[PDB]
Design a protein around this nucleic acid. Structure first.
Lengths: 62, 62
DNA sequence: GAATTGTGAGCGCTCACAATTC
DNA sequence: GAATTGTGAGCGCTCACAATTC
């Protein structure tokens, strides 16, 4: 329906886009503190990431 | 298996990448002359484009 | 003025180096 | 010296302006 982006979530929560994707796509080095603030952004705007973007950039196979 | 790129085909046939995508993805403004030279490049290297690239870049919906 | 063509620029999601922090 | 963070940079395929062509 309406896509949203990692940047839209980031801008809303007042964080970085790498802060966002830690929560979303399960990365490591952020914090538990900031995690929950991103979880709020996802909820408001209703973040749908693009699976296409997740595949294209999602690193090549070694 | 092994993906190839529009650039790889282009470089082989000695053309532009937009020259390539005309033949591949059915564009307009090239020629019939050059068309068949691209067709030869696809055949050698075995051009498999990425459907993901074609989707992500494949213009937003209006 | 519309077909042909060259160069910059972008989807949104990820990577990489180096500064920062201690 | 490794976790945390900021700025630049890229996957490959597609678009946009303007120069070229006549």
């Amino acid at each position: 329906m309406k896509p949203v982006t990692l940047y839209d979530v980031a801008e809303y929560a007042g964080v970085s886009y790498q802060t966002v994707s830690r929560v979303v796509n399960q990365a490591s080095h952020v914090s538990a503190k900031t995690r929950e603030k991103v979880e709020a952004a996802m909820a408001e705007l209703n973040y749908i990431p693009n699976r296409v973007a997740q595949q294209l950039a999602g690193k090549q196979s070694l």
